[PDB]
Design brief:
Chain B: Belongs to the ATPase gamma chain family. Chain B: This is ATP synthase gamma chain. Chain B: Produces ATP from ADP in the presence of a proton gradient across the membrane. The gamma chain is believed to be important in regulating ATPase activity and the flow of protons through the CF(0) complex. Chain B: It comes from Bacillus sp. (strain PS3). This is part of a larger assembly, with two copies of chain A, one copy of chain B (56 residues) and one copy of chain C (476 residues). Chain A has 471 residues and is α/β, with parallel strands linked by helices. Chain A is 35% helix and 18% strand. Chain A has an eight-stranded mixed β-sheet, with helices on both faces. Chain A has a six-stranded antiparallel barrel with strand order 1-2-5-4-3-6. The radius of gyration of chain A is 26 Å and the shape is elongated. Chain B is rod-shaped, with a radius of gyration of 25 Å. By secondary structure, chain B is an all-alpha fold. Chain C has 476 residues and is of the alpha/beta class. Chain C contains 15 helices and 15 strands. In chain C, the strands form three sheets. Chain C has a seven-stranded parallel β-sheet, with helices on both faces. In chain C, strands 1-2-5-4-3-6 form a six-stranded antiparallel β-barrel. Chain C has a two-stranded antiparallel sheet with strand order 7-9. In chain C, α4 crosses α5. The N and C termini of chain C lie far apart (86 Å). Classes of the chains: A alpha/beta (471), B mainly alpha (56), C alpha/beta (476). At the C-D interface, β4, β6, α6, α7 and α10 of C face β1, α3, α5, α8 and α12 of D. Bound molecules: adenosine-5'-triphosphate (3 copies) and magnesium ion (3 copies). One adenosine-5'-triphosphate sits at the interface of chains D and C. One adenosine-5'-triphosphate binds next to α2 of chain C.
């Protein structure tokens, strides 16, 4: 009947035999509740999600908590539905797990409050809305070279320890104060120290009242980590459609969704492809990322961090995700080690809004002209690496001087960096950012030394920092 | 002229020492990237061979 | 009998038991109303690919044989509608109201049924029309890295086909749906949709429909072709069709290959791209035409999927990111881009004005590389190096700004014949615009002769007009 | 004694013959079905056996699409290998892999002789190995890798570099003059080029001395595999029984090797190397060792090979390199610089560059050019980093001459009339030696380098310079 039995256990994966003619649907949830009937046995609460129909009345299921203790013959109840997450105003101010249970020790959510499914179909072509206006973050490099878009997808690529989370915290600080709207923070594979740290940042700020948080972390079993992103997004989808409020969705590491799928996919019995990745990588990523869209009813802007597996961009997972993103910044380890914070690649980062219409002609001649100076510097990298700058002549000398100025003037002092370096932070408005680049490009500040162009806000700050040195 | 020619040859000598030292450092850095790649390809060809052999 | 039951369901792939009279390539119908295609037939299991949401198909559901091979709906009613790979309307706006169907596994027109392509497809981009020409029925590949301008060169082509009795199809494979709605609104604004059909296969769909989408698109155009009207087709990514087959196949359990691609990648791409042709006068003289796309990681010409598709097509247009960031747009590497039909696909004037150009912009590229390492140079090299730079300027062109062919031949005649040398390099892009204005107000006779004759007028008259303008133009 | 289909696995089919009178490897079968009801589709199919499995069951590769195939149909056993019309009936007509005429010109009679496509290769008792030089009029080949009359010639290159264009220049020159049958076949051939070649043969009149087999890129793999053997059986009949000397043109013989891979997994073979069949060297040997010039008569053979992924170290090209007498390798780096035809003057070598088979004066000049171009290759690294002015007078004079030699290897073809405007040239061998000797001795070094591109004779280079104003 609805009761089914366990037959095989294989790390994350479990196999459930059901009665003939009464099998669960393909994303449906099951329950194990067992009380020890002898000293040897142990007691369990667990829930599982159906993933394949295996033949012979058997359904293969990924699990949502650790399967240690599972004894073949543990009985299974059937929920009849996908994992159902509590939604409404009751979510605001609360911390959650994948199962929907509150982990904040403030109570438990009333059983009569409506809970909606996690797996729902994607939005239709008739509904989607396309518009462009520019979102202002005060960070120099984003505002000139690759501007972010309201209602879009914003992606932060980088290798291990290269500065993804600090840029996310600076974005939270500036944007969520000015936003006037709902926020959701969803942590997939997030270092636990950060979770204790942020909950306290949000309570101290008073910003907690207008936001909700889902966490599944590095310690949890692989199954729970996949479904956590989908869990965060069903709450956000209620705020955009039924309340009608505009929303921000922040995802801590989107790479762990593919990585968790890679481990469980091999045990589910699928064959592997490329560098060990599953044979369903494109479809699984796309099913999640198509839901994250602006609509006629309202708008979601999503800020995502992508961990590159090694410093290898060509690896299949990071490159499948590049196509779904509107604005992208790619941090580079080599710059971080030179001392350029934030470490954005000026020539690799791209966004749909660097168009003469959207950002305006002035912000346009200036942006392309910056890229032209920097690209020449990469060609001259492999000559100046051996001989030095004696071989260079004429235009080569002038181009390297101005490239050094530009590359240090893209670096900034952040309010979130105060916990590492004693300096105060700076916010640079766009009109200042565009104006500043022009004077460097004309050559009006040729005399000032390169060490005065680091970690400053608006251009004037370089003149007083030079005057402190006297060089 | 005797100061000028003595100081030139010296200048060329200094540049050439530093140029050679930069080149030899680049040779060890490049050599490791080649070895890292050779090891990488070998593992890929073996895994594609064994994946088809496991299927059949 | 004709009824079976599903035994395995997963990842969009199904196996059924029973269904004895099925054919390879049939359509099969599940109880839910979702449709499917049979691709394998073992002794006890039929292998079926699901063409719809599989979250309602359980083991022990029935599946029943339709009796039809895979068929796509065709008719005049599809023009101006946004449609699925299966003939199902997506834009809203109700039914498509088609009349008949065609197989998606048609045979290509054989040898002895084709003619040399002998008529232009004027794109309105100076570099493509002058250096890398396309003629009706010649397959041409647009290959570049992400965000290099590839989609723009295609959309600009559809917009500049309004006067000619052309029908165009845009197949979006693997694209996020918001982008396709943006493309459709862009076409509607330029008035293009009145003679176009959009076929959509968004990234959320089961990979089987991504795989069927290009075939559906050509199946829709060949109907018009065998009736005589000329047609153009665009595939937004064939590299996403390849990825989708790899999942469809690795999943089916067919063993792997080079990378993890099956060996049947070359068959898949040949089957699709060989249905593009120019039929002969006995068949009524129609034309299909094709523009596939291919994205390459790190901008590399030398790789498995790129070289397979470069082997099938009648030329290529390779777009480079390092040119794109250096102010040349649209950025086309002239050294790596050549056309097999170039020379036959041009009006007589353009053959005479601009014949050695693709090679010319290659000698400048090499002589630039050598002289950045040559110090002093002689008179014959300083003269020639200048021409290539004058040429790279004249080849530049901004987005959403078409240039008619008669104006292209006149500016290239200044460039090839060499009156353009006097103007400094920085003023060349500006000189062009003032020349087009002067030509419209005063020089109606020269343009009349070009539209009338498809040939160049008397040299003395041309020299007189251009020399006179060189009096009017003001320079640094 | 008839048969029944059991498994249809894409290109492969499995037929169980219950009589116990199973067929043979390399034999061909027939599936002729008329539709009983409206649901079915009429089918006409041929299948060639590959393997005997256990339960009275045989694996077969199809020569047409397996669409509409239903389990339980009927297969008729011919009892022989695929059989092809051979005789004067082939001259002037185009046929499919099975010897059925594709062209609208007519239908071959059932009284005609047919021969079997499969046959053991010629033997050491009756092969022969005399050397003569074949003139082409193409500068690179006539100097650095002379083609040998009665020998195998191979054109290697990666995708889209000129293999097809170079075949059309050789066919314009060699076809008209030769007085013997010439067979042209097209394994994996682009159709837009098969149709163009028929009209090119009709213009000139080469059609009366020619026969053609076409197998397009769009056919099932089985057809692409056997379209090489069909051309070969026709050329063999003209060599052996009629005794006239002959040319064979095979277009993209890599597509033969590539087809085997596709069918290997469905036949049940384990994979080898870079996703290739376990039997690569065998199949290449069986086909290639039939293509010989015997004591009875000579087959001069010219083949195009596609270098699978711009990697000359791949198995299919490497194995192929062992079976050739002369080879020209095409490089995309030269094609980017615009030096057409884009031929490597170092990697292209032929067994005939020996002093006796070409003369002392020819050999001296040829090896001396090869020293100049190898010296330019190492020196380009030093120039790229340190700069050209840094180097000695002898090093400067090498770079001077090597630039001119490399551009003077380029030539204006008749098939480049459509691609480059200018009409075209034929350079006799004596002239090519005179000119290259002048470049090496420095007589023409005053002229500017841009005049050596796409030209035929050295006389022309002097005038082209005059127009420039030198
Ligand atoms: N803007 C900055 N100001 C000061 N220090 C910085 C800045 N950006 C990076 N760093 C330093 O580099 C390190 C970056 O740590 P961070 O928490 O941002 O790593 P991460 O990239 O988010 O880690 P992970 O890859 O695991 O997710 C810290 O030591 C930090 O102090
Ligand atoms: N001639 C031009 N002048 C200026 N900007 C141009 C020109 N041509 C293209 N661009 C710009 O280049 C970018 C091209 O974006 P687009 O998405 O069309 O590129 P793409 O390479 O086709 O993208 P994808 O990789 O998704 O296929 C836009 O910023 C566009 O405005
Ligand atoms: N001698 C030549 N002169 C000028 N252009 C040439 C010459 N040879 C080749 N080309 C150019 O290079 C192109 C090569 O196309 P072609 O299809 O012949 O390449 P391929 O290497 O034979 O292709 P594949 O490997 O797929 O069979 C020609 O269409 C032309 O544009
Ligand atoms: Mg983090
Ligand atoms: Mg695009
Ligand atoms: Mg070719």
């Amino acid at each position: 009947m609805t009761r089914g039995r366990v037959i095989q256990v294989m790390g994350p994966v479990v196999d459930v035999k059901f009665e003939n003619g009464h099998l669960p649907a393909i994303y449906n949830a099951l329950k194990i509740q067992h009380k020890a009937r002898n000293e040897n046995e142990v007691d369990i609460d667990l829930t599982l999600e159906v993933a394949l129909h295996l033949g012979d009345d058997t359904v293969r299921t990924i699990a949502m908590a650790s399967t240690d203790g599972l004894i073949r013959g543990m009985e299974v109840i059937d929920t009849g539905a996908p994992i159902s997450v509590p939604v409404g105003e009751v979510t605001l101010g609360r911390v959650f797990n994948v199962l929907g249970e509150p982990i904040d020790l403030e109570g438990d959510i009333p059983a009569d409050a409506r809970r909606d499914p996690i797996h729902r179909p994607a939005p239709k072509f008739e509904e989607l809305a396309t518009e462009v206006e520019i979102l202002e973050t005060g960070i120099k490099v984003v505002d000139l070279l690759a501007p972010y878009i309201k209602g879009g997808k914003i992606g932060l690529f980088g290798g291990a320890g290269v500065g993804k989370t600090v840029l996310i915290q600076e974005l939270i600080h500036n944007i969520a104060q000015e936003h006037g709207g709902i926020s959701v923070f969803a942590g997939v594979g997030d270092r636990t120290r950060e979770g204790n740290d942020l909950y306290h940042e949000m309570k101290d700020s008073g910003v907690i009242s207008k936001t909700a948080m889902v966490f599944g972390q590095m310690n949890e079993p692989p199954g729970a980590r996949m479904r956590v992103a989908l869990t965060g997004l069903t709450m956000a989808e209620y705020f955009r459609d039924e309340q009608g409020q505009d929303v921000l969705l922040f995802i801590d590491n989107i790479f762990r969704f593919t990585q968790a799928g890679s481990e469980v996919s091999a045990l589910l019995g699928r064959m592997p492809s490329a560098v060990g990745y599953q044979p369903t990588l494109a479809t699984e990523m796309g099913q999640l990322q198509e839901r994250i869209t602006s609509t006629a009813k309202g708008s979601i802007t999503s800020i995502q961090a992508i961990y590159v597996p090694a410093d290898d961009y060509t690896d299949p997972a990071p490159a499948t995700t590049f196509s779904h993103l509107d604005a992208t910044t790619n941090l580079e380890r080599k710059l971080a080690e030179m001392g350029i914070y934030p470490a954005v690649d000026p020539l690799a980062s791209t966004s749909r809004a660097l168009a003469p219409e959207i950002v305006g002609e002035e912000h346009y001649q200036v942006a392309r002209k910056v890229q032209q100076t920097l690209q020449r510097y990469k060609e001259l990298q492999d000559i100046i690496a051996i001989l030095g700058m004696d071989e260079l002549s004429d235009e080569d000398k002038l181009v390297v001087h101005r490239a050094r100025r530009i590359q240090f003037f893209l670096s900034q002092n952040f309010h979130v960096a105060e916990q590492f370096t004693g300096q105060p932070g700076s916010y640079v408005p766009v009109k200042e950012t565009v104006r500043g680049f022009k004077e460097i490009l004309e050559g009006k500040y040729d005399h000032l030394p390169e060490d005065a162009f680091r970690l400053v806000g608006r251009i004037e700050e370089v003149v007083e920092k030079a005057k402190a040195m006297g060089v | 002229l005797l100061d000028a020619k003595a100081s030139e040859h010296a200048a060329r000598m200094t540049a050439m020492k530093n140029a050679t030292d930069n080149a030899n450092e680049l040779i060890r850095t490049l050599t490791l990237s080649y070895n890292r790649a050779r090891q990488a390809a070998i593992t890929q060809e073996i895994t594609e061979i064994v994946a088809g052999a496991n299927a059949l | 009998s004709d009824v079976g039951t599903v035994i395995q369901v997963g990842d969009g792939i199904a196996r059924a038991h029973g269904l004895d009279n099925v054919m390879s390539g049939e359509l099969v119908e599940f109880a839910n109303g979702v449709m499917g295609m049979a691709l394998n037939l073992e002794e006890n299991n039929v292998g079926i690919v699901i063409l719809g949401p599989y979250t309602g198909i359980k083991e022990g559901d029935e599946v029943r044989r339709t009796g039809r091979i895979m068929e796509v709906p065709v008719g005049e009613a599809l023009i101006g509608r946004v449609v699925n790979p299966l003939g199902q309307p997506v834009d809203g706006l109700g039914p498509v109201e088609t009349t008949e169907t065609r197989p998606i596994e048609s045979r290509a027109p054989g040898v002895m049924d084709r003619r040399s392509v002998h008529e232009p497809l004027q794109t309105g981009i100076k570099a493509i029309d002058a250096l890398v020409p396309i003629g009706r029925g010649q397959r041409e590949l647009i290959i570049g890295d992400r965000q290099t301008g590839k989609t723009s060169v295609a959309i600009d082509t559809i917009i500049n086909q309004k006067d000619q009795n052309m029908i165009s199809i845009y197949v979006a494979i693997g694209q996020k749906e918001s982008t396709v709605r943006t493309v459709v609104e862009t076409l509607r604004k330029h008035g293009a949709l009145d003679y176009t059909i959009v076929v959509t296969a968004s990234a959320s769909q089961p990979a089987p429909l991504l795989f069927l989408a290009p075939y559906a698109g050509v199946a829709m155009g060949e109907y018009f072709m065998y009736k005589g009207k000329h047609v153009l087709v665009v595939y937004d990514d064939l590299s996403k069709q390849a990825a989708a087959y790899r999942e469809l196949s690795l999943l089916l359990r067919r063993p792997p290959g080079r990378e993890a691609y099956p060996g049947d990648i070359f068959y898949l791409h040949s089957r699709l791209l060989e249905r593009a042709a120019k039929l002969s006068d006995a068949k009524g003289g129609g034309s299909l035409t094709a523009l596939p796309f291919v994205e390459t990681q790190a901008g590399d010409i030398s790789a498995y999927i790129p070289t397979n598709v470069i082997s099938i097509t009648d030329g290529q247009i390779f777009l480079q990111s390092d040119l794109f960031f250096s102010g040349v747009r649209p950025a086309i590497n002239a050294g790596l881009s050549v056309s097999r039909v170039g020379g036959a696909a041009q009006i007589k004037a353009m053959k005479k004005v601009a014949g050695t150009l693709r090679l010319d912009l290659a000698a400048y590229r090499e002589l630039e590389a050598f002289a950045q390492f040559g110090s002093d140079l002689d008179k014959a090299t300083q003269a020639k190096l200048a021409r290539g730079a004058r040429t790279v300027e004249v080849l530049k062109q901004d987005l959403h700004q078409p240039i008619p062919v008669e104006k292209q031949v006149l500016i290239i005649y200044a460039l090839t014949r060499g009156f353009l040398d006097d103007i400094p390099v920085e003023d060349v892009r500006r000189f062009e615009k003032e020349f087009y204005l002067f030509l419209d107000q005063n020089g109606q006779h020269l343009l009349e002769h070009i539209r009338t004759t498809k040939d160049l007028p008397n040299e003395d008259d041309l020299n007189k007009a251009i020399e006179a303008f060189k009096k009017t133009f003001v320079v640094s």
